Write a protein that binds this ligand. Structure first.
Ligand SMILES: COc1cc2c(NC3CCN(Cc4ccccc4)CC3)nc(NCCCN(C)C)nc2cc1OCCCCCN
Ligand SMILES: [Zn+2]
Ligand SMILES: [Zn+2]
Ligand SMILES: [Zn+2]
Ligand SMILES: [Zn+2]
Length: 255
């Protein structure tokens, strides 16, 4: 227990850090943030009259809900989990209800905006590196965490040496750099057969240039299992030569 909570009380549940390998302290060469931040002007469209919203009089579980229509359909179930019909291989954009909607703060189309649910833990792996794992089981289709970091422009990313903490959002494109500013996600390692899938979501605003990145369980995750996701082509076409993937997956396409 080298740290009770790396979020310093910002998440709904603490995220302790333990080291059972070497004697290295908890990471501290970065600033933890639970929400995306910017280090410059960023003209995100927060015009409330530009938001598309719903006028549901129920708990938004009907076929009429405008917000679900935008998402093709609401994909959350009564518990807040993704429906089996959800395409993990090619996720759709999810538009959750927002403050312009007529519904209540507890309608069914609100999951990612409710914050952390699963008890996670940061820990030192054998590789002398760091990783994240669940201290409880996570049913499939559950929202685990968001990839939070510093929001930056395309070119801005091009002039950064350390680029291992970037996440492309995909006109002009933007990125999230978790190197200097980030949440528990910056510590999640790559894996070829990932139990976490990133989903572009929209909540308080609907500026398509800035989707927020939500990670969902692509299958059951057992207490103690290590979270992971597919970093992607761009990553490996750059780091593939500095080293080969040590994910240990029978289907590894990078080692
Ligand atoms: C490490 O993996 C990634 C590298 C990226 C990168 N790297 C560049 C390489 C060249 N140096 C060059 C340089 C460095 C220093 C000084 C001058 C020039 C600058 C950083 N650039 C951009 N977007 C940049 C815009 C490209 N644009 C032309 C479209 N996105 C990236 C997304 C990555 O992971 C994605 C998966 C997530 C992994 C999460 N852990
Ligand atoms: Zn609705
Ligand atoms: Zn709603
Ligand atoms: Zn709505
Ligand atoms: Zn691999």
């Amino acid at each position: 227990i080298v740290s009770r909570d790396i979020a310093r009380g910002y998440e709904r549940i603490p995220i302790p850090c333990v080291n059972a390998v070497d004697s290295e302290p908890c990471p501290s060469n970065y600033k933890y943030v639970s929400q995306n931040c910017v280090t410059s002007p960023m003209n995100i469209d927060r015009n409330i009259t530009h938001l598309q919203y719903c006028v549901c009089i129920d708990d938004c579980s009907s076929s009429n809900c405008m917000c679900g229509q935008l998402s093709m359909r609401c994909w959350y179930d009564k518990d807040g989990r993704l429906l089996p019909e959800f395409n993990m291989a090619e996720p759709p954009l999810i538009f959750e209800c927002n403050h312009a909607c007529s519904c209540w703060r507890n309608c069914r189309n609100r999951v990612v905006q409710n914050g952390l649910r699963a008890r996670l833990q940061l820990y030192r792996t054998r590789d002398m590196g760091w990783g994240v794992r669940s201290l409880q089981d996570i049913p499939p289709g559950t929202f685990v965490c968001e990839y939070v970091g510093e929001l930056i422009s395309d070119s801005e990313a091009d002039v950064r040496e350390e680029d291992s903490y970037l996440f492309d959002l995909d006109g002009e494109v933007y990125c999230i750099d978790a190197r200097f500013y980030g949440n528990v996600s910056r510590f999640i390692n790559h894996h070829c057969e990932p139990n976490l899938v990133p989903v572009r979501v929209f909540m308080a605003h609907q500026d398509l240039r800035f989707p927020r990145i939500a990670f969902f369980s692509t299958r059951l995750i057992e207490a103690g299992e290590q979270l992971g996701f597919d970093y992607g082509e761009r990553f490996w076409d750059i780091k593939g030569k500095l080293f080969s993937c040590r994910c240990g997956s029978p289907k590894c396409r990078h080692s």
